[PDB]
Structures are given as C-alpha cells and as structure tokens.
Amino acid sequence: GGRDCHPRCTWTKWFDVDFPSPGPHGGDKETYNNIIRSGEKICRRPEEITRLQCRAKSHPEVSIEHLGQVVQCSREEGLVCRNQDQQGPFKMCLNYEVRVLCCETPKGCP
Numbered sequence: 641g642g643r644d645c646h647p648r649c650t651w652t653k654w655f656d657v658d659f660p661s662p663g664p665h666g667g668d669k670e671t672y673n674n675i676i677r678s679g680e681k682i683c684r685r686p687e688e689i690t691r692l693q694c695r696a697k698s699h700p701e702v703s704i705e706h707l708g709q710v711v712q713c714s715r716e717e718g719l720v721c722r723n724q725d726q727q728g729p730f731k732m733c734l735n736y737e738v739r740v741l742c743c744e745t746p747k748g749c750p
C-alpha cells in the first residue's frame with residue numbers, strides 16, 4: 641500500500657520505583673504494576689510493550705551477571721530481584737531500574 645506500516649517505536653524514560661531493603665523477603669520489584677501505581681506513565685494506550693531493558697541504577701554499564709546477582713528481566717512483567725535468590729552471607733539485591741520500548745502500528749496495516 642501507500643503507507644510505511646512498520647511499527648513506530650519509542651523508548652520510555654528509565655523507571656526506578658522500588659528500592660531494596662535487607663532481609664529474606666526484601667528485593668527490588670520494578671514491575672509494570674508497581675511503576676503505574678507509583679504515578680508513572682509507561683506507554684500510551686495505542687502502543688504495545690515490545691522490549692524491556694534492565695540495569696543496576698548506580699552501575700548502569702555493567703552486565704548484571706558480573707555482579708553475581710540473580711534477577712529476571714521479562715518483557716511481560718518488568719524486573720524482579722529477590723533477596724532470597726542471592727548469595728550470602730548478606731543476601732541482598734542491588735537497586736535496579738528499567739525502561740520499555742513502546743511500539744504502535746500505523747492504521748490499516750497487516
């Protein structure tokens with residue numbers, strides 16, 4: 641047809657709505673649920689979450705694996721880190737942040 645129909649995609653800002661506290665039930669839960677309930681906007685209504693990125697807030701360039709940290713960065717949910725999953729004897733998550741790629745397909749497009 642006469643239109644470029646590939647999705648238009650825009651990254652959100654980075655969100656950091658939770659901060660870890662110590663103990664076996666602490667962690668850092670940067671889920672879309674928590675982000676929205678913190679007053680933050682993620683995507684607009686027409687757009688769909690297409691990609692998630694995750695990083696340590698105060699160590700933004702490093703692979704999280706090199707910190708020995710056990711985290712999940714899932715497109716459906718956001719980032720979850722649980723203190724109980726980390727190595728001891730001080731079992732604790734670092735502070736993470738996330739950002740989202742929001743994509744919207746133009747009108748009348750397969």
Ligand SMILES: [Ca+2]
Binds near residue numbers: 658735737
């Ligand atoms: Ca956080």
Ligand SMILES: [Cl-]
Binds near residue numbers: 698699701702
């Ligand atoms: Cl870094």
